[PDB]
mmCIF file of C-alpha atoms and ligand atoms in Angstrom:
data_model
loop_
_atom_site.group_PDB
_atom_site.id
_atom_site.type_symbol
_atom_site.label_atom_id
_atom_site.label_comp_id
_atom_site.label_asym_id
_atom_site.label_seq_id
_atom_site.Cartn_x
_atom_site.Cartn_y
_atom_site.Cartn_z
ATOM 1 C CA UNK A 1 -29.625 -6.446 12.129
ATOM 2 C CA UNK A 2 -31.829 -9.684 12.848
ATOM 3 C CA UNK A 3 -30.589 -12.325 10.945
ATOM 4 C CA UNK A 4 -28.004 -10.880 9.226
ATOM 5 C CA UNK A 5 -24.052 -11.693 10.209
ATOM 6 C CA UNK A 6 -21.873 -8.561 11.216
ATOM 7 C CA UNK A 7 -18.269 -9.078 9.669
ATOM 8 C CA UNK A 8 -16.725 -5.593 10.720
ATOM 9 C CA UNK A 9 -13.299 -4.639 8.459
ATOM 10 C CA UNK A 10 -10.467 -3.236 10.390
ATOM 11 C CA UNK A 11 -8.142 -0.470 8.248
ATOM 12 C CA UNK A 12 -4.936 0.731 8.736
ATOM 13 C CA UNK A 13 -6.160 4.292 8.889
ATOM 14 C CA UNK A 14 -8.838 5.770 8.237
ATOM 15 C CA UNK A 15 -7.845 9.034 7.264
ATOM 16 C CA UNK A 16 -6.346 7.712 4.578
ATOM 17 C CA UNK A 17 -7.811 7.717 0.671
ATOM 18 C CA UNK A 18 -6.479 4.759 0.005
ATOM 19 C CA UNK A 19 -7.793 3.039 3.134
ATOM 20 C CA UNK A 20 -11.225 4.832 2.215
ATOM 21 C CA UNK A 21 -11.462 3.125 -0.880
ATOM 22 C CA UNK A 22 -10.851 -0.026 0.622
ATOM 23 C CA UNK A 23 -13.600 0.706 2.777
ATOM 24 C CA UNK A 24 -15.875 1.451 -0.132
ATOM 25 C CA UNK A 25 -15.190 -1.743 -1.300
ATOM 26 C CA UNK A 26 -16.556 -3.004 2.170
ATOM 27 C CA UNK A 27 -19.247 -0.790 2.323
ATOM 28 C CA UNK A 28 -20.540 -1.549 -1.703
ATOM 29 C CA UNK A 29 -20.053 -5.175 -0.514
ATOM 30 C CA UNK A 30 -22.268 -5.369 2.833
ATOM 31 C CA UNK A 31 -25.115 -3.465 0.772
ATOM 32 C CA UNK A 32 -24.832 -6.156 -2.054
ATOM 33 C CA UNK A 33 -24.856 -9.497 0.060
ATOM 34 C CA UNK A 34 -26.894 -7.892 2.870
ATOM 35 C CA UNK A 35 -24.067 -8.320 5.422
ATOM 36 C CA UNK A 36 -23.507 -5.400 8.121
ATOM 37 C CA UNK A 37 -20.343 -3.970 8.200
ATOM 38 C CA UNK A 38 -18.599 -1.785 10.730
ATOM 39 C CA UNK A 39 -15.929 0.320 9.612
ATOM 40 C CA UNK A 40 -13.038 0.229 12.005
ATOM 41 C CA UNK A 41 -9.987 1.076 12.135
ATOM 42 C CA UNK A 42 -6.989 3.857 13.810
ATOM 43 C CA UNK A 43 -6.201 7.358 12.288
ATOM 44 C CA UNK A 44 -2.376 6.348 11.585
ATOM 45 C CA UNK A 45 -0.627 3.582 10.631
ATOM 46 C CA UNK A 46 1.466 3.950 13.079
ATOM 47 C CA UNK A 47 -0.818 3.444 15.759
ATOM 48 C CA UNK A 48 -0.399 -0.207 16.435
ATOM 49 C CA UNK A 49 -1.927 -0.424 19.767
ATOM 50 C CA UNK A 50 -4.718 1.353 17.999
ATOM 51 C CA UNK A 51 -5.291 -1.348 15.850
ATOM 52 C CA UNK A 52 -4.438 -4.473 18.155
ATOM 53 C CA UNK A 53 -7.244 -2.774 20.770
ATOM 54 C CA UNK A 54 -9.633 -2.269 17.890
ATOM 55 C CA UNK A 55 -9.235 -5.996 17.075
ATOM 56 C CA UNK A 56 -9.837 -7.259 20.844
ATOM 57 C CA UNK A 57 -13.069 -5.213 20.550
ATOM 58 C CA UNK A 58 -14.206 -6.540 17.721
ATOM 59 C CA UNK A 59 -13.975 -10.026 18.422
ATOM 60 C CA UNK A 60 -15.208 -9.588 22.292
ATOM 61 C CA UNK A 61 -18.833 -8.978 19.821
ATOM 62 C CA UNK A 62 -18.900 -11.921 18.097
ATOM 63 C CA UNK A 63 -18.881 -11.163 14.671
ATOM 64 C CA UNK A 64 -19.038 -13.549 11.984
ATOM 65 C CA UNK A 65 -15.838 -12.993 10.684
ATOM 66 C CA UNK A 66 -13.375 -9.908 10.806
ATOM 67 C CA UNK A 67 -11.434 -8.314 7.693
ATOM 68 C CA UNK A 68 -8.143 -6.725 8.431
ATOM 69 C CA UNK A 69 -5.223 -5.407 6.805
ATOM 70 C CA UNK A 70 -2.604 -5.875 9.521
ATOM 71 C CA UNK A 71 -0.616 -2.415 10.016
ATOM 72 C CA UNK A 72 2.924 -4.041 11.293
ATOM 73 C CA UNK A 73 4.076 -7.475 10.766
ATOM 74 C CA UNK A 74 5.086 -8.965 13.605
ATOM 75 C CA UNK A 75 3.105 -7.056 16.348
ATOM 76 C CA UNK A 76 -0.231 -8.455 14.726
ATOM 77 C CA UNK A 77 0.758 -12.080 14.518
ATOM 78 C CA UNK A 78 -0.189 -12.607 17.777
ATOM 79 C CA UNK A 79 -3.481 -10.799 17.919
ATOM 80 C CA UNK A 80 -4.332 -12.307 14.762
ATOM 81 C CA UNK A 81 -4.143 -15.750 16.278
ATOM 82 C CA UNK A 82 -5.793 -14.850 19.607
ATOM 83 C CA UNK A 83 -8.588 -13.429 17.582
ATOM 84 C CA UNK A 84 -8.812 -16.976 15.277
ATOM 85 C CA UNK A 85 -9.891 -18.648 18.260
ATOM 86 C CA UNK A 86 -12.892 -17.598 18.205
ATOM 87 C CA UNK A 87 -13.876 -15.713 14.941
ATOM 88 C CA UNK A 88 -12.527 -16.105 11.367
ATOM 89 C CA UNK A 89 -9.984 -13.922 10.158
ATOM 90 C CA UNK A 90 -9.620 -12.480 6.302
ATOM 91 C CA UNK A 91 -6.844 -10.282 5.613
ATOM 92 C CA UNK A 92 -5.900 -7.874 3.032
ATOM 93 C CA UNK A 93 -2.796 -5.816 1.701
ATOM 94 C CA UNK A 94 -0.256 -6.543 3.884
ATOM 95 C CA UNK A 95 1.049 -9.528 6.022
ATOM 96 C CA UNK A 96 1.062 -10.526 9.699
ATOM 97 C CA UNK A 97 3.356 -13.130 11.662
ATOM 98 C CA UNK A 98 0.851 -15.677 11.801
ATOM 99 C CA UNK A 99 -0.845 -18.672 9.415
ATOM 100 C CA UNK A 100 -4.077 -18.463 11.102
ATOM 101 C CA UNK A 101 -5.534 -16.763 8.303
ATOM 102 C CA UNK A 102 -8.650 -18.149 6.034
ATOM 103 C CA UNK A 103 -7.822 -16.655 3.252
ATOM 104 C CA UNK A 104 -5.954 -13.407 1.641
ATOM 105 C CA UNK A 105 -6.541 -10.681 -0.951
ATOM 106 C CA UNK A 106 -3.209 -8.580 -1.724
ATOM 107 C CA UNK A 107 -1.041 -7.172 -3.960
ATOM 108 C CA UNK A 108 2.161 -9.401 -4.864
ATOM 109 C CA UNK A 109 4.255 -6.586 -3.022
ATOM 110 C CA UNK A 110 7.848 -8.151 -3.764
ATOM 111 C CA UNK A 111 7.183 -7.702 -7.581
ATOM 112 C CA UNK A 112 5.034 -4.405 -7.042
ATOM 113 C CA UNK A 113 8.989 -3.624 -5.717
ATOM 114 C CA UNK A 114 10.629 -5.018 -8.775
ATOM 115 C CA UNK A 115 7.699 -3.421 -10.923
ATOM 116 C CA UNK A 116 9.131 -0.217 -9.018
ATOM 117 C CA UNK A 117 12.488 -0.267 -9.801
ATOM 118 C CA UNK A 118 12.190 -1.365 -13.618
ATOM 119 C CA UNK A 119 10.360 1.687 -13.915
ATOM 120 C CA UNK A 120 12.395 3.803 -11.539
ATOM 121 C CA UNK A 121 15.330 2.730 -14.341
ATOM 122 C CA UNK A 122 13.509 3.396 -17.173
ATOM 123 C CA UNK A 123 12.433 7.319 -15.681
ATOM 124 C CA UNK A 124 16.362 7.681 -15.478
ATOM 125 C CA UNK A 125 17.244 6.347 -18.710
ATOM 126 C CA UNK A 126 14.404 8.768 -20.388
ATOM 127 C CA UNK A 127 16.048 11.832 -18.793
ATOM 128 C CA UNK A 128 19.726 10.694 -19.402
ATOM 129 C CA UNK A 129 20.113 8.404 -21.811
ATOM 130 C CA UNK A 130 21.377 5.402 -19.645
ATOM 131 C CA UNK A 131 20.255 3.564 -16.037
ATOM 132 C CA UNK A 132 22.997 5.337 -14.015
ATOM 133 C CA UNK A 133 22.900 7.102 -11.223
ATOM 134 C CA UNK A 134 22.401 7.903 -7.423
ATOM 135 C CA UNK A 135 18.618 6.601 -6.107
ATOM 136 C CA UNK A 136 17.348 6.346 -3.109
ATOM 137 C CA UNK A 137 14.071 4.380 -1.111
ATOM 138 C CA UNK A 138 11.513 6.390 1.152
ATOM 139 C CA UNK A 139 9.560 3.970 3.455
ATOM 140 C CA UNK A 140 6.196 5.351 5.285
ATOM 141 C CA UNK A 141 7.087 3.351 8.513
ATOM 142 C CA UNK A 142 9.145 0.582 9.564
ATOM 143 C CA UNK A 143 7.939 -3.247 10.043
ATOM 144 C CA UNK A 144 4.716 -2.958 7.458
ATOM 145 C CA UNK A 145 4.116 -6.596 5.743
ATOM 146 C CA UNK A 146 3.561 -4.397 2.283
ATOM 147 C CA UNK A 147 6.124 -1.995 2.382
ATOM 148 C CA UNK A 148 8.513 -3.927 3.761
ATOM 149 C CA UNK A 149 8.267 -6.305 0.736
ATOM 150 C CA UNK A 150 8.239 -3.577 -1.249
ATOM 151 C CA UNK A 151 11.451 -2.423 -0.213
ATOM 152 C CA UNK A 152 13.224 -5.817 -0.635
ATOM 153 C CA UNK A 153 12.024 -6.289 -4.731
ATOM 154 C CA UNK A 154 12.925 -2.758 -5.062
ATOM 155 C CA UNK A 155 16.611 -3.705 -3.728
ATOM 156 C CA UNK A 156 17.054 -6.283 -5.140
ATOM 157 C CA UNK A 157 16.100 -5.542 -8.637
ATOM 158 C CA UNK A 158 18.385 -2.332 -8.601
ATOM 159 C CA UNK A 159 20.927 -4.902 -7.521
ATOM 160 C CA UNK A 160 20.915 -7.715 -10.002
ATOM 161 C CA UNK A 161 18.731 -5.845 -13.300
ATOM 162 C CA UNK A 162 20.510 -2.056 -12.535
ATOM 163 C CA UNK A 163 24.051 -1.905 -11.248
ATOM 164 C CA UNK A 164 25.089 1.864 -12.587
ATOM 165 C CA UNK A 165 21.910 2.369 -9.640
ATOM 166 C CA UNK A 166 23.399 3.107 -6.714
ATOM 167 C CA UNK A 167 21.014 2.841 -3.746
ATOM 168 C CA UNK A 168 22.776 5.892 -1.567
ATOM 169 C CA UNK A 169 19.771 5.840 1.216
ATOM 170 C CA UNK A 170 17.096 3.902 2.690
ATOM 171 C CA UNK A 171 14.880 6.362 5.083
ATOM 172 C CA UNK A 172 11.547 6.056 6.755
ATOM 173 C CA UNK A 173 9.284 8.359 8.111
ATOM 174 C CA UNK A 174 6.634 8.421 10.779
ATOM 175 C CA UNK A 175 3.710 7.714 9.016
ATOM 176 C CA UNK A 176 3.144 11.493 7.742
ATOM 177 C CA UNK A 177 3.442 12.754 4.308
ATOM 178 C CA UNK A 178 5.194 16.178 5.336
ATOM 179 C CA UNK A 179 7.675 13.891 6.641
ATOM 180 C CA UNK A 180 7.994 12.392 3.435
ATOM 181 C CA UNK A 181 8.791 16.100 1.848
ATOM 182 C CA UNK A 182 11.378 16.858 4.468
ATOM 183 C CA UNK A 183 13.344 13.539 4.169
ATOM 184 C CA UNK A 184 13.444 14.435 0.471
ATOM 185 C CA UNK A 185 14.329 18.081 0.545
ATOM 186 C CA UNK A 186 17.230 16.668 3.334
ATOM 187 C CA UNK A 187 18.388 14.344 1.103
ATOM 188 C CA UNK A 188 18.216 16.121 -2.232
ATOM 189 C CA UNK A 189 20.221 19.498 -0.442
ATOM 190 C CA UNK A 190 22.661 17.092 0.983
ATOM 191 C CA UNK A 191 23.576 14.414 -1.892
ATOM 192 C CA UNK A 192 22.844 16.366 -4.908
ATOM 193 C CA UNK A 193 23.560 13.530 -7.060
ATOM 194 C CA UNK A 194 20.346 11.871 -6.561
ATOM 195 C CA UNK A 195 18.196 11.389 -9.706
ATOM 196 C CA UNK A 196 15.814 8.994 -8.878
ATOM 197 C CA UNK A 197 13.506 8.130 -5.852
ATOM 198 C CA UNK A 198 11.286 4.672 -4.606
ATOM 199 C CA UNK A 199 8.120 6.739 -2.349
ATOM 200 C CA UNK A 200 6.826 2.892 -1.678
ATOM 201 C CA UNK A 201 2.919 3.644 -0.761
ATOM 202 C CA UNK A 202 0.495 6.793 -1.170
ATOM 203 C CA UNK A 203 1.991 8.992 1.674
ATOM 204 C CA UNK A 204 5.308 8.951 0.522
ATOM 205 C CA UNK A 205 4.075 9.927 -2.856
ATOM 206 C CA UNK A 206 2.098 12.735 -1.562
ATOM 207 C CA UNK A 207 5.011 13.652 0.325
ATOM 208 C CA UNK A 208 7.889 13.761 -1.460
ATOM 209 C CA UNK A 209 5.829 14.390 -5.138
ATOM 210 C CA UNK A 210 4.635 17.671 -2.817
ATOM 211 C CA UNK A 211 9.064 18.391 -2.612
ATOM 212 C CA UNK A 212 9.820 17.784 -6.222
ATOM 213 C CA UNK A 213 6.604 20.201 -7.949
ATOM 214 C CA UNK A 214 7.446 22.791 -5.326
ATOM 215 C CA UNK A 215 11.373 22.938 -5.964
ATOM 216 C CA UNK A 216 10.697 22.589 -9.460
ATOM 217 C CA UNK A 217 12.623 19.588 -9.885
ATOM 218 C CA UNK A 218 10.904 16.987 -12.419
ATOM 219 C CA UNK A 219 13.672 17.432 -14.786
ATOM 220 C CA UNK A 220 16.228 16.604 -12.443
ATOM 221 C CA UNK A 221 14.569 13.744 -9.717
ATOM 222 C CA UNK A 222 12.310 11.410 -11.014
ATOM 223 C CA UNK A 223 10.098 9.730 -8.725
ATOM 224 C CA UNK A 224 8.447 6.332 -8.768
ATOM 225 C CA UNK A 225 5.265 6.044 -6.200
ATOM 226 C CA UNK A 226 2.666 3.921 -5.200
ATOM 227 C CA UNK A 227 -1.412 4.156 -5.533
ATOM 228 C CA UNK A 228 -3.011 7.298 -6.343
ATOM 229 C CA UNK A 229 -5.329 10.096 -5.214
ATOM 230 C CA UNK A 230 -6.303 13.435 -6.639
ATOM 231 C CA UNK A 231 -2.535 15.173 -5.507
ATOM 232 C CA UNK A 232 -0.644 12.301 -6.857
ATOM 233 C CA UNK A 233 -2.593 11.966 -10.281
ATOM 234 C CA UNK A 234 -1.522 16.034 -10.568
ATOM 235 C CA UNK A 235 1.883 15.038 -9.802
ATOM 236 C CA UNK A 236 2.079 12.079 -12.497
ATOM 237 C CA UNK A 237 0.667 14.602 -14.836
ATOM 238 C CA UNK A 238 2.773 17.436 -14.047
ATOM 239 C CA UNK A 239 5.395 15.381 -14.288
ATOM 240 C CA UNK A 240 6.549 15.676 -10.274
ATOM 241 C CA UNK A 241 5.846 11.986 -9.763
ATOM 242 C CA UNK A 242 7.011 9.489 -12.772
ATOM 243 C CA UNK A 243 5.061 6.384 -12.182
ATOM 244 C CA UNK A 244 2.866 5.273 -9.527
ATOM 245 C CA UNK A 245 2.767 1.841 -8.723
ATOM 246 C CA UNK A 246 -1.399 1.024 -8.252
ATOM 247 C CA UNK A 247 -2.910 -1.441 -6.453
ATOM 248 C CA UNK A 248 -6.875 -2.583 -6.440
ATOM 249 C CA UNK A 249 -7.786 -1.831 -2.951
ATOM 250 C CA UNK A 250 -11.514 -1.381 -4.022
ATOM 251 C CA UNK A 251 -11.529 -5.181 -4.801
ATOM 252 C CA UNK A 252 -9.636 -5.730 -1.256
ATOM 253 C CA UNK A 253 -12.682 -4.285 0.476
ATOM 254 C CA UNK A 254 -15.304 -5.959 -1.771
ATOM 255 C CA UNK A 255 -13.647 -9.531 -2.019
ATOM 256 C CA UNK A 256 -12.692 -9.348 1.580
ATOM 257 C CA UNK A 257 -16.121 -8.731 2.343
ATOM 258 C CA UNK A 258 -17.611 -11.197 0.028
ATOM 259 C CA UNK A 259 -14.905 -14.111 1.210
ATOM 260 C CA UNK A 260 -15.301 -13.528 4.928
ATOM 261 C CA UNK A 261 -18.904 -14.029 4.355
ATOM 262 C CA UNK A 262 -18.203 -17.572 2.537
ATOM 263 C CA UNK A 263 -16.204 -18.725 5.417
ATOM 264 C CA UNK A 264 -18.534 -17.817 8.117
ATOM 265 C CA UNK A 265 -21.025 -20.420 6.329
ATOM 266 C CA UNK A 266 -18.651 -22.830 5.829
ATOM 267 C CA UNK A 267 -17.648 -22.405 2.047
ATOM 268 C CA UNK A 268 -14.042 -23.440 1.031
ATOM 269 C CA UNK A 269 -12.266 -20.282 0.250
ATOM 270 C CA UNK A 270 -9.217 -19.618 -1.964
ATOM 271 C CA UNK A 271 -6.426 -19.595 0.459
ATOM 272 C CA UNK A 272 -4.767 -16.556 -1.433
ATOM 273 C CA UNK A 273 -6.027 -13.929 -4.044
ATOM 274 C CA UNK A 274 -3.503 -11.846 -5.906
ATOM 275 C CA UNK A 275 -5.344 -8.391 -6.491
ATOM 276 C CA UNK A 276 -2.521 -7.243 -9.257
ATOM 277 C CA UNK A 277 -0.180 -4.091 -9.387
ATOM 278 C CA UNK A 278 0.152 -1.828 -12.592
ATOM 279 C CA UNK A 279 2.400 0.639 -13.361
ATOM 280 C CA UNK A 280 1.152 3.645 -13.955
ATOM 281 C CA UNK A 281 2.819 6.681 -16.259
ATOM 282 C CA UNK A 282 1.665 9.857 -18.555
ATOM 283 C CA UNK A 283 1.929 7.330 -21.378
ATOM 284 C CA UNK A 284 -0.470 4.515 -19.994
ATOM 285 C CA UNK A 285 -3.317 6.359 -17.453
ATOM 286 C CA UNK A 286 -5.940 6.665 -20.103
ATOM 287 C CA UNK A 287 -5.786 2.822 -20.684
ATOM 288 C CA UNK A 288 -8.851 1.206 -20.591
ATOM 289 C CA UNK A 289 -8.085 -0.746 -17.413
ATOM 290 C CA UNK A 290 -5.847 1.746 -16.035
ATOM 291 C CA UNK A 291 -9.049 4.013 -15.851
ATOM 292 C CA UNK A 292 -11.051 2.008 -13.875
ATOM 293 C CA UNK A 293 -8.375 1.879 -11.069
ATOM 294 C CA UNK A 294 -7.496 5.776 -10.593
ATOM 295 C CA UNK A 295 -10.762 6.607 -11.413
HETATM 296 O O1 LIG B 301 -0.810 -1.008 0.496
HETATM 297 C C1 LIG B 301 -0.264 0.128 1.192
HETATM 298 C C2 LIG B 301 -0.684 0.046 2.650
HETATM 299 O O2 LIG B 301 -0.152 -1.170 3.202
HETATM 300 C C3 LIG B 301 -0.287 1.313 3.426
HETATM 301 O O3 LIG B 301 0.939 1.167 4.145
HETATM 302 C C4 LIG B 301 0.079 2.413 2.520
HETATM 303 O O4 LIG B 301 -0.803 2.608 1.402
HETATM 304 C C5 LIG B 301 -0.785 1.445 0.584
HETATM 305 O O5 LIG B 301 0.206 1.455 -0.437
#
């Protein structure tokens, strides 16, 4: 409208709960401060030159500022600084290659890895009596700031904190949870040794959560996740999924929002927000604080 800044947000995907509560966030955000805000973004992660086009668009408008969550690391960098140019940049949940940022609101994803694999250990122990055994790591997609982080605290916690762990395979799919539930039910038929799995965001968890209820295997795999959603809350309560690792992605949206409009009047921002990461089990979802996340 007249007289009132646009500061679009740019998602990974928007077909995606988790990106839709990020969004949300946005949304609740541009009503509050009376700030418009377009709601942009691909339908896949994986779409890259989705995103980098969506970008170019957006600041060829000249917006007031632009949130993003950058879908691959390095591809963005570039874009990201291109776009600074001309129009403030805000991102959220997961890095890019460049420093040309004003500010960003994100899990600490190398310790929502570590977070991960403490619990993964402690699943195992609970079935078997001791931290030993074969695990393994399902990644989304390759070359995500988030998950890629994600996957290094993982490792190296399982390294240093768990060595009867043995990490036995490292896969990643193509963005789509029924890829997720074949790389499991692959891996599973072929090593049956495995007892525990890292599914490092919400796909994965739908996915290969999905392979453990429907093989009837909770008392034999136990799963760690990420973030939640109406499938993977059944899962953690069925006991098909563990622990899910959850992130605030409602306060992404909203603080994005509400920073990017501080910096487009000038307003000294803080240069990096840490949004948190809980774990999340059967034993703990009721919490209080807990509540308010999952919903
Ligand atoms: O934060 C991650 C996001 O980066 C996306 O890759 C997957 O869902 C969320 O876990």
């Amino acid at each position: 409208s007249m007289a009132e800044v646009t500061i679009p947000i740019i998602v990974k995907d928007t077909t995606s709960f988790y990106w839709q509560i990020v969004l949300a966030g946005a949304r609740k955000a541009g009503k509050d401060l009376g700030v418009k805000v377009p709601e942009l973004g691909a339908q896949a992660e994986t779409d890259v030159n989705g995103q980098i086009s969506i970008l170019e668009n957006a600041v060829a408008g000249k917006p007031a500022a632009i949130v993003i969550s950058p879908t691959e690391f390095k591809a963005l960098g570039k874009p990201v600084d291109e776009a600074a140019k001309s129009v403030p940049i805000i991102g959220i949940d997961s890095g890019a290659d460049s420093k040309a940022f004003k500010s960003f609101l994100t899990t600490d994803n190398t310790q929502g890895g570590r977070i991960a694999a403490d619990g993964l250990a402690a699943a195992i122990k609970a079935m078997t009596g001791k931290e030993e055994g074969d695990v393994v790591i399902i990644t989304n997609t390759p070359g995500a700031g988030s998950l890629e982080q994600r996957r290094t605290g993982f490792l190296d916690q399982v390294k240093t904190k768990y060595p009867g762990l043995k990490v036995v395979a490292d896969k990643y799919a193509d963005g789509q949870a029924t890829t997720g539930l074949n790389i499991m039910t692959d891996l599973i038929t072929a090593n049956p040794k495995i007892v525990g799995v890292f599914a490092s965001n919400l796909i994965m968890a739908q996915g290969v959560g999905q392979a453990i209820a429907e093989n009837k295997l909770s008392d034999k795999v136990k799963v760690i996740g990420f973030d939640s959603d109406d499938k993977t809350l059944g899962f953690l309560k069925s006991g098909a999924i563990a622990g899910l690792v959850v992130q605030d992605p409602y306060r992404m949206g909203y603080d994005g929002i509400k920073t990017a409009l501080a910096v487009s009047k000038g307003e000294k921002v803080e240069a990096n927000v840490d949004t948190g990461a809980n774990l999340v089990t059967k034993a703990n979802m009721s919490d209080p604080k807990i509540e308010a996340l999952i919903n």
